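Weekly sync notes, structure subgroup
Attendees: PM, AL, DS (notes)

Item 1: joint prediction request from the bench team. They want all twelve components modeled as one assembly rather than separately. Inputs as received:
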Amino acid sequence: AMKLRALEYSDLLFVHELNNEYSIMSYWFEEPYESLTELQHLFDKHLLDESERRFIVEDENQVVGIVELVEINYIHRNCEIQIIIKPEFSGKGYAKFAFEKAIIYAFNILNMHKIYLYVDADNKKAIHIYESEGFKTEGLLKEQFYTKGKYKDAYFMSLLKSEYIL
Amino acid sequence: AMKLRALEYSDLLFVHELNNEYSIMSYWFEEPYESLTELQHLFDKHLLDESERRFIVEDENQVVGIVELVEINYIHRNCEIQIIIKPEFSGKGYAKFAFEKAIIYAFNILNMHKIYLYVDADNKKAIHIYESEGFKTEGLLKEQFYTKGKYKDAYFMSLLKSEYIL
Amino acid sequence: AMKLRALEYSDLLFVHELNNEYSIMSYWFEEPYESLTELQHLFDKHLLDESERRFIVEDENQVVGIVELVEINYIHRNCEIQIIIKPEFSGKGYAKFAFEKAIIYAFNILNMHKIYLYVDADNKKAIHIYESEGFKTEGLLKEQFYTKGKYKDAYFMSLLKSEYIL
Amino acid sequence: AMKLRALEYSDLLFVHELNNEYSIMSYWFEEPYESLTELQHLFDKHLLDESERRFIVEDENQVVGIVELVEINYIHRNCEIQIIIKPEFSGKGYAKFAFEKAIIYAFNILNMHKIYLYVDADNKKAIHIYESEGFKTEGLLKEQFYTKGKYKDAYFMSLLKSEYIL
Amino acid sequence: AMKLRALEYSDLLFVHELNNEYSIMSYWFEEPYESLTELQHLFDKHLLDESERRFIVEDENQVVGIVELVEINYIHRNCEIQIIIKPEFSGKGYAKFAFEKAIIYAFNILNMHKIYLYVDADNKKAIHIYESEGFKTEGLLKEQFYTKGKYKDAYFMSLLKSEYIL
Amino acid sequence: AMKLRALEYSDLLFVHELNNEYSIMSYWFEEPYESLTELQHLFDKHLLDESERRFIVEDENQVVGIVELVEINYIHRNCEIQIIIKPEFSGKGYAKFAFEKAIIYAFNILNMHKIYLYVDADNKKAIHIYESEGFKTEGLLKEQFYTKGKYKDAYFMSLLKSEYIL
Amino acid sequence: AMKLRALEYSDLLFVHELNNEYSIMSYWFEEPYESLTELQHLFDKHLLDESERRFIVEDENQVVGIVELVEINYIHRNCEIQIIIKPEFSGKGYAKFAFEKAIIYAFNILNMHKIYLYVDADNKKAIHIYESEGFKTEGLLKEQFYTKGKYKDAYFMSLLKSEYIL
Amino acid sequence: AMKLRALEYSDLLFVHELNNEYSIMSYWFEEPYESLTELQHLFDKHLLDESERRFIVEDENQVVGIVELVEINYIHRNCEIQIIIKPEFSGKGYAKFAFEKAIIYAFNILNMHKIYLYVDADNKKAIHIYESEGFKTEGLLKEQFYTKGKYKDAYFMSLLKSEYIL
Amino acid sequence: AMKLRALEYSDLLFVHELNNEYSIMSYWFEEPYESLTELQHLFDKHLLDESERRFIVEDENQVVGIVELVEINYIHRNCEIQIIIKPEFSGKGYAKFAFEKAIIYAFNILNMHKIYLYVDADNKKAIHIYESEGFKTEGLLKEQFYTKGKYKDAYFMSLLKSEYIL
Amino acid sequence: AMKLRALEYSDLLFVHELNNEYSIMSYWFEEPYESLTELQHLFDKHLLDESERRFIVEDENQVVGIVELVEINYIHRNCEIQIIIKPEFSGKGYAKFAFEKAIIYAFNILNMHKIYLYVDADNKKAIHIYESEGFKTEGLLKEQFYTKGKYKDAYFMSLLKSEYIL
Amino acid sequence: AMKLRALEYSDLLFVHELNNEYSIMSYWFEEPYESLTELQHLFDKHLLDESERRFIVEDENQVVGIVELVEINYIHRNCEIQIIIKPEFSGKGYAKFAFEKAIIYAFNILNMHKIYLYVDADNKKAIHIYESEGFKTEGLLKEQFYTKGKYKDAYFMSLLKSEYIL
Amino acid sequence: AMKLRALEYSDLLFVHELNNEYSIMSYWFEEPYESLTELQHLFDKHLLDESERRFIVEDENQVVGIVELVEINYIHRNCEIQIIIKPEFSGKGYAKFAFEKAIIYAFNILNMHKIYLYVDADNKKAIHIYESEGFKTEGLLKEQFYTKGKYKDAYFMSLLKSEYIL
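Output from the run, pasted for the record:
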C-alpha cells in the first residue's frame, strides 16, 4: 500500500539525501541548500509559509520519494509540481502513484485550476510519466537551466483541472 | 468510564492523526496545518488565546476523539462546536457522550447562550447525532465548502441554552 | 466620481469614527477595538495578513465609507462582506456603488466562488441594498448577536459568482 | 450635550490630573501609578487587555470625568465600576449621566449580569449617586482600605441587570 | 507531621490535578488555565510577581493540598485566601492546619492587616472550617459566580489581625 | 534626457500609484500588496534581498515608470523583466528606452544569460514593444492568469544575450 | 502655595542640577549617575520599580527641591528619606514643608511604620530640620561615608509613626 | 579542613534550604524569593552584578553554610555581612571560621574600609560570635524588622579595617 | 586646502552619487548596494567593523571624493586601497593628494606593511596616478572583472612600506 | 571510492583539527577562529551566506580533507579555491581528486568563469598539484602573508573555464 | 571661572573634534573610533559602564577640553588619567586646572589610591604639566606606541594619594 | 610531549580551578569572575573578541596550565602575557615551554612588536622565568596592586621582537 504523508521535520534527512542524488542545486522556499544543516534551518524559517507544500511518498516499508507543490498561487490558482522518486525504485509505479495523488491534492483539495512543471527536454522517461498523467507541452524554454556545464532547454508542461475531469 | 480532559501539548500527535483521517484541511486558531510539526508550532503561538478550547475524549483505555469549541465569542455568547471521534469507535456512544459533555461545558461553565455547528448536508450519520442532542437547522449554506473536488452545501445547526434546559 | 481605494494607515481615524456610529462592538482581524489608539496597534500587528481586505469608499470630495472583506478563505473561496456608509450619505447610491465594486473585486480579482454577509433581520433598508445586488437568504440565525440589551436574529445572505454572471 | 467617548492615549494627562485630586493611590490594570510618565508606560503595556475598559466623560466644551469598568469577568459576567468627575463639576448631573451610560454599556453592550462598586462608608454624596442608579449594599467590608492614615470601612454595592430592566 | 512548603515549578501537575477536581474555572495571576501546559506557561510569565503567593500543603508522605494568597495588596495590607485540600483527605485536619499556617504567614510574616475569602453560600462544610478560624461574614454577594449553569451567591468573609491576636 | 535610477524608499508612492492603475494584484518580493502602507513594510523586510532589482524610469521633469527585474537567478543566469510606464506617457518611447537600458543592465552588468517575460496574449501593444527589443515567444501558457473575471493565456517570451549581441 | 508633585521624566534636568550641587556621588535605584544622559537611561530602566518614590517640591513659581523615599520595604514597612532643597532657598521653610508632606505620604498613604535617614554628623543645619520633625538619633555610624577625601561619621535618625501621631 | 568556596548555580538548593530554616523573608540582590525556582531565576538575572558576593562554607564532607557580602559599595568601601550556618552545626566553630575568612576577604581582597551587620537585639548567641570577631555596636534601630508578628529592634554592628589590623 | 576627513553617516548621499558615476557594482563591507537606502542600512549594520575604513576627500568648498581602505588585515598587515574622485575634478591633484594621505594613514597610522589595488589594465590615467605614488605591478589577472558586457583584465599593483620610506 | 560531500555542523571538529595542523591563522567567512568553540559559533552566524561553500573530502573509510570555495562572486563569476588534505594522506591522490571535483563544481554547477588560488611561492608540492590541474601563475605578490615570523611571497594562480574545457 | 562638568551625549561633537586634532587613534571604552557617528554608537553601548569617567573642561564662554579617567579599577584603586586641552588654549592654565580638579575627583571622590598616565618621552610640555602636579616617572616603556610611522617610547608616570596630601 | 592548544568552552573548569589557587581577583576580558558559573557566562559574552587569546598548556597526560595574551593591540602591536602553571608542576619546565611557545605565537603568528607583563616585585621565581626568556624591566610601579591586605609594587617587564630574533 502506497501513500502520501505530510512532510515532517524528521523527514529532512531523506529530503537531503534524495536531492543529493541530483547535481542541480536544491531549493527550500526558493532559498538554496546543499547540506542537511542548511535544510533544517530553512525549514524552521518557512514553517508556516503556504506557498509550498510537500509530501513524502511511502509504501508500508519505507519512504520512497517526495512530492513538492511550489509557487502555489491562490489567486491565479496554479502551482508547479516537482516529484522525485529514489532512482532504485524506478519503474515500480511510485512516480505514477505520487503524481496521481498530488494532482488530486492540488485540484480537489487545494482547488487549483492548473498545475505545471518544468522538465529537461532530454529527460524522456520523466516526460513520459508526465504525458501519461495528461500533461501537455506549452513551451520550450531554450537555455533556461545550467546543468553539468551546459545550458539546457526545458519543456513547460501543464494540466488543466478541466482536462483532468474529462 | 468516559471522560473529557483538557488538551495538552502531548496530545498533538493524536490530534494530527485524527484530522489526517479527513481530506478537508485542518485549522488551529484559524491557521491551516497538515503536519504534526506545523501543529506544534501553532500550538505554542496560540497557547493563551481564549477563542478556542479543546478537549480530548477518553475512556480508561485510550484517547478516542476530540471536542473543539471555536469562534468563542464572549459578548454574543456563542461558539461553534466540532467533534471528531476515531472512525473505529463509531456507534459506541463516544460521540453522544462528547456532545453531552461539551454542551454542558459551553452552557454551564462558559456561560454561552448558543452553540452552533456546520455539517455537510449529505452527512446523515453526523446530522442524526446532532439532532439527538437538540440541534436545529437554521440554514442551508449552498456551495459553502470545497471538498474532494466539489463545492458542497452545509447545514448551519444550532442549540439555544434556553431550549437545552427545557 | 466615486471610487474604492485601498485602506491606508492614515485612514484609521475615519474607520474609528464610522464604527463609532454603531453600538455593536468593532473588530480588526477578529480582535476587538473601541478606540483609535487600539485600532492603530491592531493595524500594525495584522499588517500583512491576507484574511481581511479593506477599502475606503470615496467621491472626489471626501471619504464616505468602508468596504471590508473578512474571513477570506482561499480554499473554499468565500468571504464575508461588510459595508458601512456614513449615515449622512444614505440614499445617495454610495452603498450600491460600494457593493457593486466589492463584489467585482471579490469575484473577478480575488477569484472567490461565493460571498456572504450577516444582517439583523430587522434592518430592512440594508437587506434591500443586499437583495438589489442579488444576495439571497440562506439562513435565519436566531439570537445570534447581542445588541442594545437584546439577542437578535440575523439573516445569512449570500451571492454565488455563478448567479452573479447570469 | 454630554457623551461618553473611548479613552485614547492623548487622554492620559487628564486621567493623571483627575486621579491626582485624590490621596488614594491609583492603578492602571492593577499596577500602581503616580505620575503621567508611569501612566503612559502602563497604558502601552496593557493596550489590548480586555479586563478593563475606560471612557472619558465629556460635554461639548471639555472633558469632565472618567468611567472605568475593571475586573471585567466574561464567565461570571460582572465587573467593578469606578467613576470620577472633576470636583468643580459636582451637582451638575455628570455623575448621573456617566453612571447611566456606563451601566447601559455594561449590561446592553458587554452583556454583563451584575455590576458592583466599593465606596467609603462615609462618602454619603457618592453613595446617594449610587443608590439613585439602583445600587444596593451587599456588604460592609471593615478596615478594607487604608486612606489618610486610617483603615476605613467600605460598602460593596451592586446592581443586577434583572433589577435594572424592571 | 504536616507542613507548608513554597510552591515549585515541579508542583504544577499537582496544582493542575487539584483544580481539575472542581468545575469552576481556574486562574493563575488572574489568567485562566485548564491544562498543565497552560499552567506551566503562566507560571513562567508571572514568576516574580508578588501579588500572589502559594504553598503546597504536605504531610511526610504526600502533597495534600495548596494554599493560595492572592490579590495581595501591600498598601491596604489585605489579601484573599484560597485553600484546596484533596477531597480524599477531608476531615483529617489538613484544611485546619493549612488555614492556621497561612493565616500566620499572612499576618506575622507578610504583615497583613486583614485576610478575606469568598465561599459559595451553600458550601456549609467550607464555611464551618472558615468560621472555626475566626472568619466573619461581611457580605452576601448575590449571583456573583456562575457555576454549573446557575448564578450563585457568595459570602465575603474576613479576619482582622487584631481579632486574630485576641 | 531619460535615465534609469535605482529605486529608493521615497519612490514607493509612485510605485504604489503606478501599480494601482492595473487590476492585476501587485507583488513585492512575491508578497502581495495593495496599499502604500503594505508596500513600505515589505520594502523594509526585503531591503537586502538580491532576487529582485528595481529602477525608476525618469526624464529630467518627472518619474515616468518602473523597471523590475525579478526571479533573478545567479546560477542559471536568468531573470524575469517587468516594465510599467505611466499610461499617459505611452508612445513617447519611454518603454523602448526602459527596455533598452534594463536589458543592458541585465546582460552587461548583472551578467545574465537570458531574460524572459510574461505578457497577456491579447496585449498587442506590449508584445510589439517586446518583439522590437528582440524577445521571442517560447510558450503559450493557457489560462495561466486570472484577471477581470477570466483566466487568460500568456506568452512566455525571452531574449538570449547571444542573440542580443548579434 | 507650596506643593509636592510626582516626579516626571521632564524633571530629570532639575534632578541632575540639584544633585550636581553636592560632591557626594548620586544614585538612581542604587545605580550611580553623574550626567543627565545617565539619569535619563536609569529612569527608563527603573520606571515601574516601587522600591523608590520621588516628588518634586514646588511653589507656584518654580521647582525648589526633591523628596526621595528609597529602600522602601513593604514587609518591614520602613523607608529611607532624602530631601534636597536648592541652597538658594534655604531658611524659607521649603525643607520643613517637604518633610512634613513626605512623612505624611510615607505614613498615611504608603502605610509605613518607620522612616529613617542618614546625615553627616557635622551637618548641624540638616540635623536641626530633622530633629524639628521628630527624628531621633539611633546610631552613630563611624567612617561610614567617604566625602571630600575623608571618611565621615553619619547619624542614623528615625521616626516611628506611633511617635508621629502623639 | 574548612574552606570558603565561591557560590555556583548548583549551590542554590542548599541556599534555598538554609534560608528556609528562618521565617524572615529571603532576598537575592534585594529581590525576595521563597522557592528554589524563584532563586534560580534571580540568580541568572543578577549573574554579573558586583554589589553582592557569596561563598559556600564547607568542610571536606559537606556544605555547612553561606557567607554573603551585600550592599557592597566601592566608593565608601563598606559592605554588609550575613552568615548563616546550618543550625545542626552550631558550636562547631564554622561560624567563627566563616567570619574570619569573610572579613579577610572583605578587607584584604576587596579592599573594604568597614564591614557592618544587623542582628536582632535578642539574638545573644549571634551577637557573641560577632563581638568575638571585633564587631562593635553603633546603633540600636528600634522596630526596624517585622518578624513573627512583632516589630523587633536590631543592633547595627561594625568593624573597621583599622581596628582589625591592631 | 585639501584634507581627508572620516566618513560620517551624513556622507552617504555623496558616496552613493559618486559610485553611481560608475557602471561597476558597488559594495559596502562586501555587500552590494545600488541605492542610498541600501547604503544607509549596510552602514548601520557594519558600523563598528574594522575591516574597512573610509575617508571623504575635501577642499574648503566641497567634498570631492572618497578614499576607501578595505580588506584590512591586521595579521598580514595589508589592505586594498580604492580612491574615487568626482570626474569633474580630474587633473586638479585631488587624486594625488588623496593617495598621498591614505598611504600615510595606512602605513604610519594603521601600521600596514603593504598596500595594494586592482585597476583595469586599460585605465591608463589611473595607472599613472598609481605609478606616480610608487605602486608596482605584481600581477595581471585575466578576465577577472565583468564590466559593460566584457570580462576585463586587471593589474594587481602594490606598495611596500619599506619602498615607501626610501 | 572517494567523494565530496557537503559540510555539516558535525564536520566542524574535523575542520578544526585540519586547520590546526597549520600555523597560519584560520578563517570562517573572513572571521578568524582558533578553537572548535569559535568555529561552531561562526558556523551558526554564517549559515545561509552564499559567499563560501565547503565540502568534506572522503573515501568510504574516513574524512580526509576539505574543499573550500570562498570569495564567491556571482557577478564577475569567480571564486578562490582552498584545499587541505590531511598530511598523512599525501601522495594518495586525494588532493588531485578533490581538485578535479571542486573545479567541476565551480564551473559546471556554480557556473563560474574563473577560479584562482594563492600559494606560498616556496610550496612546490602544492604548486605542482595546482599546475597539474591547469592553474597558471598570474602574479607574484611579494610579502603578502606573514607566516612563522617572516613575510612571504605568494603566487596568484588561476584557471579559466574556457581553458578547462579545451 | 573654569569648571569641570560631566560629559553629556551632546558633548560628543566636541570630543570628536578634539581627538581629531591628534593622529594617534582614539578609543571609547577601549573600542576605536574615528568619526562622530562611531562615537555616538559606542557612547550608547557603554552608557552605564563605570570603568571610565569623563568630564568636559569649560570656562563660562566655551568648552576647552576633556578629562578622561580610564581603566578605573575599584579593587586596586587606581586609574589612568588623560587630559586634552584645545591647542589654541595652551598656556592659559586650563590644563593645570583640569589636572587639579581631576586629581581631586579621583582621590577625594572616587577614593583612588593612585593615578597614572602615559606620555610620549619627547612631549616635554606635557611632562612639565604632569611634573608640576606631582607625577613621578616610574617607567620608560620603549617602543610602546606606534605614531606617525615610528615606535615611540613612553613614560609611565604616577601620583600616590599619600604623596598628594603631603 | 608538551603542547599549547586553543582554549575551548570545556576548559573553563580548569581555568576556574587554576585561578582559584591565587587570592588576586581574576578577570575574563577585563570583567571579574570568582565562580565557574560567572566564567561560563563571560566566555559566551566575549566569544569572538580578539583582544585576548588563551591557550591551554598540556603534556600528553593532563592540562598543566594556561597562557593568556591580553590587551592585544593590533596598531601598536603589543600585548600583555600572563602564564599560570599548576603549582604542583613547578620546576618541571612547563613554564619555560609555555613562555617559549606563547612568545613565538605573539611574534611569529600574531606579528606583535613587543610583549610585556607585570610581576610582583617580590616574586623572584617568576621574575627569573621571565628574565630567562629575555624580558627586561622597564618600570617599577609602586603600590600598583592590592593583594592580601597590602599595596604591592610590580615590575613592568617587556620583550621586543627585535631583541628576540638576535
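Discussion: The longest strand of chain L covers residues 136-147.
Action: AL to compare against the crosslinking data before next sync.
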